[PDB]
């Protein structure tokens, strides 16, 4: 009985961690996308203007 009481909490906490990690992976992918977009926009803006020597 004690062991099953422990196992229930362990399962719940592991599920919470798994949800956090899935969110982390999704955020990572979208952050890569946003960073690529930002770098492309920066190169574009730099090439357009006649800025600098």
């Amino acid at each position: 009985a004690q062991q099953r009481t422990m196992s229930e909490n362990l399962r719940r906490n592991l599920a919470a961690l798994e949800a956090k990690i899935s969110e982390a992976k999704t955020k990572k992918n979208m952050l890569q996308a946003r960073a690529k977009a930002a770098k492309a926009n920066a190169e574009l803006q730099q090439t357009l203007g006649g800025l600098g020597t």
Partner: protein, 107 residues
């Protein structure tokens, strides 16, 4: 700042030298060529970005179908007298629909 003015003179003389070293058509053609290659690279980057867009759309549309599958499984389980599998199936559908929502937003 007298040393600064001396350095200014040293720099201006070198600038005059490099400006007299510049042929007109050679440098013009190279200015065009460099712009061309930069445009090459920029077009490739924009292609990568636009591509990530469709790739995002793909996972979105696919999580949608997986959600529909889990819903149908929940229904079928509820039609056979199993009140345990249907609950987990509904929960999985809810998770995948949340994911689809986020994917839609980012798309």
């Amino acid at each position: 700042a007298l040393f600064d003015r001396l350095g200014r003179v040293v720099r201006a003389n070198l600038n005059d030298l490099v400006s007299k070293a510049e042929d007109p058509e050679k440098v013009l053609e190279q200015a065009v060529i460099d712009m061309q290659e930069d445009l090459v690279q920029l077009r490739q980057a924009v292609a990568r970005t636009i591509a990530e867009e469709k790739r995002t759309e793909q996972r979105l549309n696919q999580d949608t179908q997986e959600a529909k599958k889990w819903e149908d499984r929940a229904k079928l389980a509820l039609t056979n007298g199993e009140e345990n599998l249907a609950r987990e199936a509904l929960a999985r559908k809810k998770s995948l629909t949340d994911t689809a929502a986020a994917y839609q937003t980012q798309l």
